[PDB]
Each structure stands twice: as C-alpha cells, then as structure tokens.
C-alpha cells in the first residue's frame, strides 16, 4: 500500500524559511503521511499538538494540511499556541483558539544564522488591527499612529512595519532561530486525502 509520502522534507529540510510576517503557507494534499517520524526524530526543540494528540495520529486523515512555515527566535515559539498573545500572535501569525493540528519547531542556529545582518528574516512591528486566523499581511504600507499619515515618509509616528531578527552566531540560547512548521489539519467537507500509514 505504502508507495508515496507527502513532500514533507521539502520544508522539514528546506534551505531557507520565510520571514514570519510573510510566513509561507505550503498547502499539502494528495499524499499520505507517516507523521510519526515527522515526530520521532529527537531533533525538534518543540512539537505540540492542539485539538489532536500524537497518540493514534496515524489514523488521522484530513481533506488537507496547510503547513505554515517560518523562522522565529527560539523562545518566542511560545506565542505559537492557540489563544496566546505576543508579537507573532498579535501581528504576525494568529492561530485560531479552536485549532486542530500540530506545531513543530527546531533549532537552526547552524543554518539560518550568519554574520553581517541577514535581512532574510523579518516580522511586523506596528499595525492598526490585530490579526485573524491564518491571514497573511505580506503587504507593507508604512504604519501611522497619531496626527498625520506618513506620505511614504518614515519618521516619528511613521515606521517601517517589518524589522529583522539578525541571528548572530554569538547569540544567546533564547535568541536561537527555530524553524517552525505549523501543520494545520483541515477537514472541511472534501475527500480526506492526507492519510496515515496503512
């Protein structure tokens, strides 16, 4: 029966990950998944399943999964928890409180860490309204807060909404880049296709 898998390694090993503000949303469907090894790796610094549990997970088929993926400095993976607050939650990535899936996060300070300032990685900093479940504000109009709009000028009350991390090699432990993959297991009303082994 087992012949193929979902192209999980195409992110669980991918060369670069998105800035969390523009977090990639790799849609996964039309495949099967041996989720256990996606968990039994002893390499992840975090794997928490919400609305589901790692037990019996391989029985779980879904219409699809929406593997959201990005990079955030290690500790702040805690804002990846449904109903959490925080800048990733408030302004970069909102997990619905009624989430049904899993979250994966590992260190990558060997890979996504470089001197000189890696402007590869970015996150939103100023924003009018809080976010929505699985919504992505890649667009980058420059925020305003008080009397005047910004005209395209950035100054006081006028700041570029995205700032970087700068994963310096000499960073502290709490500063390390966790690559994060959020496997949202969606079962709307379509055929369930992303099944488990056997």
């Amino acid at each position: 029966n087992i012949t193929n898998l979902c192209p999980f390694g195409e992110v669980f090993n991918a060369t670069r990950f998105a800035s969390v503000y523009a977090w990639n949303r790799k849609r996964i469907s039309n495949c099967v998944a041996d989720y256990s090894v996606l968990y039994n790796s002893a390499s992840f610094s975090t794997f928490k399943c919400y609305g589901v549990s790692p037990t019996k997970l391989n029985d779980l088929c879904f219409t699809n999964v929406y593997a959201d993926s990005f990079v955030i400095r290690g500790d702040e993976v805690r804002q990846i928890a449904p109903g959490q607050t925080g800048k990733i939650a408030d302004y970069n990535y909102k997990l619905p409180d009624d989430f049904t899936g899993c979250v994966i996060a590992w260190n990558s300070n060997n890979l996504d860490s470089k001197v000189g300032g890696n402007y590869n990685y970015l996150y939103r900093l100023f924003r009018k309204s809080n976010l929505k479940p699985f919504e992505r504000d890649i667009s980058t109009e420059i925020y305003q807060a008080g009397s005047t709009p910004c005209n395209g000028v950035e100054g006081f009350n006028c700041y570029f909404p995205l700032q970087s991390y700068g994963f310096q090699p000499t960073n502290g432990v709490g500063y390390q880049p966790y690559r994060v993959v959020v496997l949202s297991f969606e079962l709307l009303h379509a055929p369930a296709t992303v099944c488990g082994p056997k």
Epitope: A14, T15, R16, F17, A18, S19, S69
Partner: antibody, heavy 130, light 107 residues
Framework: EVQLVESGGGLVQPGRSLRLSCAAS????????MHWVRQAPGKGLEWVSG???????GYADSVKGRFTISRDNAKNSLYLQMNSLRAEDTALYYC????????????????????????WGQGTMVTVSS | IQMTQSPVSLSASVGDRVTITCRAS??????LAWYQQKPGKAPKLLIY???SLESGVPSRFSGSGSGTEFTLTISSLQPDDFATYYC?????????FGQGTKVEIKR
C-alpha cells in the same frame, strides 16, 4: 504565453518608496524562485534580489534592507517594496524566474546554483529625479 | 565572486566563427548561463551550466571551459545575432553577470 508583466514603475523622487509587481503567468509560479534584476540605462544587467519558492534570499550589497522582496503564491504576483531609493537605483527592473525546479530544493548538498534567470519580464522602468 | 568577459567588443561579418570568453575571480565550479540581449529588449537564455543546451535555441551556439575561464562560440552566423552578450557566476548569491561585450557584426 509563459509570460511576465510588471508594473508600478515611473518617476519617483529620490528616497521615496515604491512597490513593484510581477503578475507572472503560465509556469507554476508557486515553484520557481523569482529574482528582481535591474539593468542600468544601456549598461549591463545586475542582480538586485531574489526569493525562494517559500521566501527569503539575500540582495545586492548596497540594497539590503532598503529593499524588501516578497511574493504571494496564492495570488501569482511577486512584489518588491523599495525604500530610500538612491541615485543608482534608476534602472529598468526585470522580473525573472530561476532556471531550476526549486520546489523542494536539497536540504544539505553543496550546490548554491547560479545558472538561472530563464524568462525575463518586459521590465518596468524606474527613475530617480529631483 | 566576479565574472568578466575577455573581449570588450567585436565585429566579424556574417558567416563567421568567433569566441567570447569570461574569466572569474575564483573557482566558480562549472555552472554558467549565457545571455544575448538585443538593444532595448529583454535578455535571453542561451547556455546553462556553462556547457549544456536548452530547447529553444539554434545549435550554432557552443559553450565550454570551467573553473575560472569559460567560452561561448558562434560558427554559422545569421543577421540576428548582432547583439550584446553576458556571462554570470553562481558560487554564492549574489551571482552577478559582468561587463557584456557587444557584437555589431558588419565590416
């Protein structure tokens, strides 16, 4: 045809921001890693920035930060938010798609391709005037 | 690193066999692509990997070399090819292109 069309280009004051577009067509824009490559007036081509199938690549040296690539596979339109445009960024910017199938590149294989940029968009001219 | 053609320009009438060579600033493996860019239009792809061929070009083009120096040659020639030509590098993004030698063939 397998075509690129870019917009948002014209006279812009020095340092004033601007956002391009590249409403690519045909090819699975969800796979190949775009790049914005600017040709000076008459002079050579020159890589400005790139972006992987998911996101994130370096830029040219004097253009990091002040530029910001981005895309949206769910819409088919690469972006380029340009900020603090200096004198030299006056050029014609071409959208371009990397040569190889960068859907799921190798995790750990010593490659770092640089034989790319197959299809070039028509190019959206950009000036810097006072 | 860098990638600079050896000629600066050249004219050599139709029906001629000519070479254009690009030398590096360091060992750039062996990946390279070649661009002919007619005046005012969008550059085109000619050779990838510094040797192979891609479907969509007449076979008259040829590429060889490795390491630091590479070469692109045109043997049987047509009116169209009168155009600018560019190399590039790969080692590490950014991978630039280089000066670009013209070809204004007519003598």
């Amino acid at each position: 045809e397998v075509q690129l069309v870019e917009s948002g280009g014209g006279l812009v004051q020095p340092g004033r921001s601007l956002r391009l577009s590249c409403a690519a067509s045909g090819f699975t824009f969800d796979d190949y890693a775009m790049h914005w490559v600017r040709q000076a007036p008459g002079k050579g081509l020159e890589w400005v920035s790139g972006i992987s199938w998911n996101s994130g690549i370096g830029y040219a040296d004097s253009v990091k930060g002040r530029f910001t690539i981005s895309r949206d596979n769910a819409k088919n339109s690469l972006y380029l938010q340009m900020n603090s445009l200096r004198a030299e960024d006056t050029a014609l910017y071409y959208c371009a798609k990397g040569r190889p199938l960068d859907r799921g590149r190798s995790w750990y294989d010593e490659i770092q391709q640089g034989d790319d940029f197959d299809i070039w968009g028509q190019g959206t001219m950009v000036t810097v005037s006072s | 690193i860098q990638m600079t053609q050896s000629p600066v320009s050249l004219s050599a009438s139709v029906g001629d066999r000519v070479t254009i060579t690009c030398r590096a600033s360091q060992s750039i493996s062996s990946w390279l692509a070649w661009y002919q860019q007619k005046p005012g239009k969008a550059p085109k792809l000619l050779i990838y990997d510094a040797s192979s061929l891609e479907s969509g070009v007449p076979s008259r083009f040829s590429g060889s070399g490795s390491g630091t120096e590479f070469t692109l040659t045109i043997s049987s020639l047509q009116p169209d090819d009168f155009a600018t030509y560019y190399c590039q590098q790969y080692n590490s993004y950014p991978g630039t292109f280089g000066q670009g030698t013209k070809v204004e063939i007519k003598r």
